[PDB]
Symmetry: C5
Subunit: 312 residues, 5 copies
Amino acid sequence: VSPPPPIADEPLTVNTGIYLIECYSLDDKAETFKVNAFLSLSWKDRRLAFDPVRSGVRVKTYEPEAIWIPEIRFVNVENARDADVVDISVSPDGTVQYLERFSARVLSPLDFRRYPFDSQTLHIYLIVRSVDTRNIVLAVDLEKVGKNDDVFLTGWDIESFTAVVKPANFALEDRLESKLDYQLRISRQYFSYIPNIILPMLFILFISWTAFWSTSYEANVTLVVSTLIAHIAFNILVETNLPKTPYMTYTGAIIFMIYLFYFVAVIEVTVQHYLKVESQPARAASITRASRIAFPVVFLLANIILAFLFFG
Amino acid sequence: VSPPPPIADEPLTVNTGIYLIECYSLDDKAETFKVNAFLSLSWKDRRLAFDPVRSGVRVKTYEPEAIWIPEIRFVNVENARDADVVDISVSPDGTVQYLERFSARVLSPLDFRRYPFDSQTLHIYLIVRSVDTRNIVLAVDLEKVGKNDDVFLTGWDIESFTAVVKPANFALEDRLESKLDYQLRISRQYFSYIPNIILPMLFILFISWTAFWSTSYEANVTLVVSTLIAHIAFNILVETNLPKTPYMTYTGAIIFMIYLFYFVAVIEVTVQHYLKVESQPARAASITRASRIAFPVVFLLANIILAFLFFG
Amino acid sequence: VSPPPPIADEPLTVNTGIYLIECYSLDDKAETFKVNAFLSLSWKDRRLAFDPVRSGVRVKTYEPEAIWIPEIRFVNVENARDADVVDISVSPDGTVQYLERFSARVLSPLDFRRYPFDSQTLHIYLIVRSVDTRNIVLAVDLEKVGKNDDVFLTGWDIESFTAVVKPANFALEDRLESKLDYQLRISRQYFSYIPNIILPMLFILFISWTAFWSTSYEANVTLVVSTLIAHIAFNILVETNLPKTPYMTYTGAIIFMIYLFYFVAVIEVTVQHYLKVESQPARAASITRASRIAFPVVFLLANIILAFLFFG
Amino acid sequence: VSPPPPIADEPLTVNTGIYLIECYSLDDKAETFKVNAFLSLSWKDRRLAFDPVRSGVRVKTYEPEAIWIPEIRFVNVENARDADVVDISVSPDGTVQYLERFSARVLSPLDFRRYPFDSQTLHIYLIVRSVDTRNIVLAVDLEKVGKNDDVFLTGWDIESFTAVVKPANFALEDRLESKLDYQLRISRQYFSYIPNIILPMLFILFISWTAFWSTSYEANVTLVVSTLIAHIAFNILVETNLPKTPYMTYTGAIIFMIYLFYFVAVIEVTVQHYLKVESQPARAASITRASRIAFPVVFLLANIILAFLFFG
Amino acid sequence: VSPPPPIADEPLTVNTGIYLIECYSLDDKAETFKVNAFLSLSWKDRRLAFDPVRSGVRVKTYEPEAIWIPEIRFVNVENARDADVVDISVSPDGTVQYLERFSARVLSPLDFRRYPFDSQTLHIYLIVRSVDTRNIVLAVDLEKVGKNDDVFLTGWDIESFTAVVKPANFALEDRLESKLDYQLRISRQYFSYIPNIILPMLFILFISWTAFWSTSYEANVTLVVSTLIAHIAFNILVETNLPKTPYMTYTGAIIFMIYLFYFVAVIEVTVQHYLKVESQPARAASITRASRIAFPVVFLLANIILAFLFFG
Ligand SMILES: [Cl-]
Ligand SMILES: [Cl-]
Ligand SMILES: [Cl-]
């Protein structure tokens, strides 16, 4: 009904804590995920002190109405959280214990520079706005922060869930506010990507490379163009999931390199046929024999260079 | 309004029960399903005891307000359930009968190691938190647990719906809680998968294999590469439904094996043509006649080995 | 406020009636549909009688939440209906007149054994739970059941909308309930399926068959395999709309028959080429001449047999 | 409050009017579309003098819970509209003015015959609730009805916005005595559809038709069959724009005719090759020379006939 | 409570201000985006004037229902905003400071011409309800308006966020002529588009154009038609991210020109083969040498003309 008046000027410290229950629906395109957890609060209020001997009880229970509760809201959320108070208890000295279960959808950017083998950090921000009669700051209760063992994200491994102890005090709208930061660290499960994506593309490229052992123009044209169509289909399948980014990713570079290799192979086949028609088989044979070794070596060198550029 | 005081130290026992009406919308990728069922509660409150002879009634009817109802919550739900109270009846001795109907969306992990022929178990968890003056524990009333005869799931067969009698008692947030487990066991209907997926792939593979009785290079290239394109299309269609898993499944292994077989067939065709160009027809004929027998036997052996590995 | 007391022991009879307005969003995959209709009720309450000569000039109209209203619920609904009362009135003798409007999503199983030419029946259930002091049973008012001339589904033909007069009673949750059944009978409009699906498949099959008049191996391979690819694409397009069933459907049987025919055609072409290359042209010519007539007659006989099996 | 008392047996002529603001999200699969528009009811309330003092010439401003607002309902809506009152200004003379913004999802039939060149109409039905006072009849005020002239509905250009007074077609037990019908004429901008769809198919068809100037049977087969595959792929591409319509359409008829023409072209190629290999080159030359003129003329005549059939 | 009387004859000036917090969910079909921001208002009054003689420098926090607060509504929002009144403070001089956090989705038109390199402007319109007692003048406080500099609108980079004053220009207006316009300017990030789309199309087109250096009719036909199929597949890939735009676009014009070029190439190949068969190799060689130069130059000139036409 009214914030607790201070002694002279001291700030009011609120101890927080989040305990995860469920996290799910991590969207790569929209960069959002859904959470379901607890929220714990604690502060000091001398107006609610009591005598245990005379009252005969050691703990009091209050309804959320007719009692002062600080307004704490999240920053990076789509809407207000769906809250329902669980318990409120008061110690004889005046300490208030608060508990609540909520659910919300959080906004957090992602980095896809190493998309198949990347790790991400997810942030949840809590903020409290100071009242004009009292300054309020936040604190972290490390004993009440954690997660259940049944929590799971489909396709991700959860590593740690911590909080930054130092709040960030800044002045906004002619008022001072404090902000905490909870970080959830995850890594992507990349096992399924290898046999489903990587190896078939290598097989198709190797199949297309068999045009350097034949001298029939029509068969080479058929092989190369059909393998190109298959590559286009696989590119459609791959890009159906990865969103557009303003920077260069590993997978996009690999795909562009494959396209360039297909173009160069078509050029080589055309040159060989054109030379063969002119009754100059020696040059065509030399070019074909050179290309047979040239293509895989350059492919492996380029792959090594890209792997060092993006991961080293 | 206030929990019933204990006699000396006995905990409060609450008897539960869930009766299924409708279960539907099982999503494989999201690993969720929706429910619609009854919830029943019963406990003892001596403060509401009366004498049935004088009062003229054997059962008193109360509203949800002005009576203490324990807080029962589901653990693995995305949002708090939508429920409406049906009836509350009070026995003369003090036993309270409670009933409601709810609907909720449940999160449950799934196992896809035998995806076409797999069986799943779905879990529903009920929890209760102890108040500062009384401890509450849960119990199972076997006479009020069951499912309707009209319950159906699209694509699944429902086998049983039971509950583990023994609850789990543990401490969370400096309070004691009790949790129950309700298990729904289902198995997938795999009839539609055979003629829609399995047989056409075998037919396409045999059409690909038919190229060992020919000697024209262009025809062999056309057959093998076009069958590869058809296999790619079928693989994309299949993968559009099965989600990504951190382990290896049966279908993925089969698909990878088919890709490997196609690659080996392309290699064999190229080798035969190259040998025939160099004026060594006998070696090409021997290789072709050997491959004619080699391919199906190896395919059958690999299928048997995989079947034993995944199901035995 | 309270159920009317019985005279000696008789139950209470409530007569209902549903007037349809809109039915739409009939989904084959989810087996659900949305409805939009009115609802009318009536019952006898001797505690509300009055004398029209003196109590007032006439009878008037009132607002909701004014009189004891029986609570009726739908059984097969995903969520509780969204309603809004529109009118209510009382009779001089004591009987009460009630009305409202609702909208709900209904779950109902479907049968696809004759998918192109199938007819379905949709069920809607109303139930009432008896209170401990009075028994309530449901009745059908035939004069208030019907559908608007503006009721229409997209692609379906509505035939009738009746209600089974006889209710079904059973003891559920230690109480007696009465249930009513409303049946909506519809039929599918199959004309659009002929030129969109059926005829292109026949044209492609005939194009595949046209290869029995040529002796060039490469041309036959091209024709047959490319037509197979086209069939695969068309089949994917078709199957992207028909859900999986534990039984066999007409369309699936036809598609599997088409696949088998393609396999046999490939085998015949390979056999003809193999016989031709071994200096036995007469046998290949005889086989081709026989197949020219063999294929269409077998196709027609198989189609007739399937048509008799699935509709006889 | 209470509705105005009767004075001189004059019916309350509630003059309605809909001021469109936003029409958007036209969904065709369910015949649903949202509308964000204004409203204005201008009934006469002279008797309930709202401070007609001359010195109080200022227009009296009221809140929703200040005066009697008539209760009107929509018939073809999903759920109740979101009534957001803007302002209720009443002049001291007695004339009232009302303004609100509502959002609703409207069920209106959509006809997709003549799909590229269709002019659709949208219907909104209003009904007012009866009151204890004299009969309430809905009336149309031409100054109130209008639109913002800044509609963001892309793909359509709005012709006009009018209204027609009609009776109801429901259970008319001296109720539903006035149902207003509003009509929103719209037309589809068809210019982009020509380059987006029509011309590429004609180019593909002509590419197929180039085979009548060639003699190579393999080249003709490759041309026609690969052109058919391209046509199927382009149909797949087209299907993403059109809605799912279970009835005959001009575009579908065009597609079917294109399939038929492909079939006839394949037949002609086969006949030409058969005659040429049976050594009657004169007849083959005559047929292939006649086809060059026969095909385009028949195609154009069929197009003209179909256009006349489908456009009166 | 009522607005302060115009004793000083001063129309009430209410300085506004919006501070963006989160912007997300930009939609290209419904033309809708969601926002989270602060609504800061600062008007003046004569009542609630205090003196620091006794109370000192004391900020007086009042209740949302105790004092008068002006009513402000958005013009182009789907539903009303979700208000969370944060703080109300009154200065002894009479200045009243009001703050609120809201969430709402905004309707704003989009122009998708010059699609890969386009810019957009998002508009928010604020209006204030008028009262008879005194006028309300809306101003802009340049210190309150701003953004969080950490907005994660994916796919775009934000340029600026300012405001201006415009008249309402509404046909139903009475006294609202002080609307405000908040303009958010964004630009699409087009870097990934080049390697993802543009270069593969050029490679495919050049592979198609390699057919002017050959004389094999079958090889030329295979090259051109397979390249056309690949182009159709790549158009299918491109259509996934392209908005469904019912008017002309730069990308659409480019794609149409590509189709036209494919058609012309097919015609040229047919002409060359016809001349070679009719024994005019000089003319055939002249045409095939001219085409090698003609095609790229005409393509570049058409690209330049189209770019000038679409980009001023
Ligand atoms: Cl919040
Ligand atoms: Cl719950
Ligand atoms: Cl209900």
